[PDB]
Ligand binder design. Structure first.
Ligand SMILES: CCS(=O)(=O)N[C@H](Cc1ccc(-c2ccccc2)cc1)C(=O)N[C@@H](CCC(N)=O)C(=O)NCc1ccc(C(=N)N)cc1
Ligand SMILES: *[C@@H]1O[C@H](CO)[C@@H](O)[C@H](O)[C@H]1O
Ligand SMILES: *[C@@H]1O[C@@H](C)[C@@H](O)[C@@H](O)[C@@H]1O
Ligand SMILES: [Ca+2]
Ligand SMILES: [Ca+2]
Ligand SMILES: [Ca+2]
Ligand SMILES: [Ca+2]
Ligand SMILES: [Ca+2]
Ligand SMILES: [Ca+2]
Ligand SMILES: [Ca+2]
Ligand SMILES: [Ca+2]
Ligand SMILES: [Ca+2]
Lengths: 142, 191, 254
């Protein structure tokens, strides 16, 4: 920034761009060279894209040139960590965790079922044979 | 309905997001990702966005080659994305000069070992942890006349004239790469 | 089967061997003690309908052992929409005169529910195809049951990845491609009717039927299989029905 008569003093990166916000011209007077001034300006004037705190659900924002990067906590994903990994218990998603059949239900959780010859265990997802030779199992390997 | 098009990968430091067109008008999407020999896994179920974060899947093995496809809903219409090999294509983020200490007639410029989205043992691996020897850093400095230096670690040891002040800028680089071999220049630092 | 390997005795327990007048005809898949799913085209030139036999527990066609069980085929049900000489609706439901005994070497493959098969099984990359078919295109059939792991493809990809030819059969919604286009691995004519079995979380399910393809393991082409998911309701309804006087029965589809 420029204050009364300060321009009489030689250019200073610290006093001008660090302790204050410096314009391109002020930066150019310090670096002199065109390419050097631009190499400095690209980052100096980029602005921190993390200022909006875009990373949701406890994520951490990492600033980049004209962009950012969100590091999310284990149970979250998405550009801004907006996706809840624990809220994807639907049939199309890995068969809903069901060992055999999966039925969706709006409003409540999906439910799991089994093919004839099998019964659903207490965990509500696994299927166990209820006959000696259930379909789809290879006896000599079991 | 219309099939998605211009499927593009936006990946930096392994944060990988698939983008596509167009802006859904009466149609939703579901993305599937896989390795050539692996099963297809669904992601972003029935989303109306035109993007899908696939970071958690690709960081499972950054050296594998993944293919993704976007299903369109009002077999369903779809489009395949280009193949994507994280380790070889994810862009190297803009580096940050961590510090530099002068010792007599030499200066030690240290480059911050930034983290990536690659998880491991409940932690985020650094760019060095992931690339190991395939990663080097290049220094572009000048006496405040161009000068450069290269290191296979995160530190540069260079000669400097007593009294004069220098300015520095570094770049992360993976020499063995064919595409996206270098990151953008880090912010400029001056002693 | 071209480019596969022998299915160790007992590891392909739902595999069926179909014979007509004692001659090798086609493969098939057992789905319960009385019903076998095969391919419709296997019956295009059958004259003696009372001479069809289904053999379970087979492995080596040159040696007999106690795991073999033969049954007369009491009924062959084919969709009314299937046309001899063609490829669409290539499926047949066979009723055995007497149920087979379930043993360590004779077990039925699971017929999945429709949505499970479409939404989950269809996206499991690899599945096994098997039979005593030709080891090479235009070659001799196999003495020991062969098996091969083939990857499935969505039809759009099958078309884009296959050499565009003249007026060859279309790939309908009642079919799906699986295999390789480099000329190395594929099922073949003698494997017709055999199973395309998919392994999912500890259980195997019937997802396809060896149906057709341009030659066997032909460069630029994939094997084509009847898409079983489209016939789940059709099959279930027929298995609950009473037998008809004659062997051949054409049931409407849908
Ligand atoms: C090329 C003759 S062919 O090799 O026998 N293919 C025909 C279809 C077919 C395909 C392509 C053409 C065709 C037409 C124009 C130009 C070029 C090719 C014509 C017919 C074909 O497959 N026909 C059926 C029978 C039709 C009937 N109901 O009688 C058949 O042979 N099925 C057995 C079979 C099983 C597995 C495979 C496999 N996995 N690999 C191949 C064949
Ligand atoms: C914070 O600022 C960035 C700038 O790109 C914006 O993309 C975010 O949406 C906002 O939260
Ligand atoms: C930034 O990283 C995210 C994942 C969380 O661990 C935050 O606590 C941290 O500041
Ligand atoms: Ca000032
Ligand atoms: Ca000033
Ligand atoms: Ca100035
Ligand atoms: Ca100061
Ligand atoms: Ca000041
Ligand atoms: Ca000026
Ligand atoms: Ca000035
Ligand atoms: Ca920035
Ligand atoms: Ca035998």
């Amino acid at each position: 920034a420029n204050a009364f008569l300060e321009e009489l003093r030689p250019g200073s990166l610290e006093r001008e761009c660090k302790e204050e916000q410096c314009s391109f011209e002020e930066a150019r007077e310090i670096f002199k060279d065109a390419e050097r001034t631009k190499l400095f300006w690209i980052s100096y004037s980029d602005g921190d894209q993390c200022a909006s705190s875009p990373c949701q659900n406890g994520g951490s924002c990492k600033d980049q040139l004209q962009s950012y990067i969100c590091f999310c906590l284990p149970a979250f994903e998405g550009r801004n960590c907006e996706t809840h990994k624990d809220d994807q218990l639907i049939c199309v998603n890995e068969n809903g965790g069901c060992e055999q059949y999966c039925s969706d239900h709006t409003g409540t959780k999906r439910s799991c079922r089994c093919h004839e010859g099998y019964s659903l265990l207490a965990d509500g997802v696994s299927c166990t044979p209820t006959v000696e030779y259930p379909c789809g199992k290879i006896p000599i390997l079991e | 309905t219309v099939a998605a098009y211009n499927l593009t990968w936006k990946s930096t430091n392994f944060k990988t997001i698939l983008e596509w067109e167009p802006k859904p008008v009466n149609q939703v999407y579901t993305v599937q990702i896989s390795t050539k020999s692996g099963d297809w896994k669904s992601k972003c179920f029935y989303t109306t966005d035109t993007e899908c974060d696939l970071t958690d899947e690709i960081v499972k093995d950054v050296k594998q080659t993944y293919l993704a496809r976007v299903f369109s809903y009002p077999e369903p219409l779809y489009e395949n994305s280009p193949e994507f090999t994280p380790y070889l294509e994810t862009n190297l983020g803009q580096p940050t000069i961590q510090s530099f200490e002068q010792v007599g007639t030499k200066v030690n410029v240290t480059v911050e070992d930034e983290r990536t989205l690659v998880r491991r043992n409940n932690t985020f691996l650094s760019l060095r942890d992931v690339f190991g020897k395939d990663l080097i850093y290049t220094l572009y400095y000048w006496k405040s006349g161009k000068k450069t230096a290269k290191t296979n670690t995160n530190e540069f040891l260079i000669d400097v004239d007593k009294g004069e002040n220098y300015c520095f800028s570094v770049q992360a680089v993976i020499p063995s790469r064919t595409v996206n071999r270098k990151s953008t220049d880090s912010p400029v630092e001056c002693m | 089967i071209v480019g596969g390997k022998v299915c160790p005795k007992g590891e392909c327990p739902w595999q069926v061997l179909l014979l007509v007048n004692g001659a090798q005809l086609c493969g098939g898949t057992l789905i319960n003690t009385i019903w076998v799913v095969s391919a419709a085209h296997c019956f295009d030139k059958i004259k003696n309908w009372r001479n069809l036999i289904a053999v379970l527990g087979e492995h080596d066609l040159s040696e007999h052992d106690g795991d073999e069980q033969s049954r007369r085929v009491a009924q062959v049900i084919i969709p009314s929409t299937y046309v001899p000489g063609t490829t669409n609706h290539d499926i047949a439901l066979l009723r055995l005169h007497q149920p087979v005994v379930l043993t360590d070497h004779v077990v039925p493959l699971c017929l999945p529910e429709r949505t499970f098969s479409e939404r989950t099984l269809a996206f499991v990359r690899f599945s096994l195809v098997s039979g005593w078919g030709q080891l090479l295109d235009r070659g001799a059939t196999a003495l020991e049951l062969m098996v091969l792991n083939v990857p499935r493809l969505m039809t759009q990809d099958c078309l884009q990845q296959s050499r565009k030819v003249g007026d060859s059969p279309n790939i309908t919604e009642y079919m799906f491609c699986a295999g390789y286009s480099d000329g190395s691995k594929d099922s073949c004519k003698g494997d017709s009717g055999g199973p395309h079995a998919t392994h999912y979380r500890g259980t195997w399910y019937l997802t396809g039927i060896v149906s057709w393809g341009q030659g066997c393991a032909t460069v630029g082409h994939f094997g084509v299989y009847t898409r079983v998911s489209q016939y789940i309701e059709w099959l279930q309804k027929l298995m609950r029905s009473e037998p008809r006087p004659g062997v051949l029965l054409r049931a409407p589809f849908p």
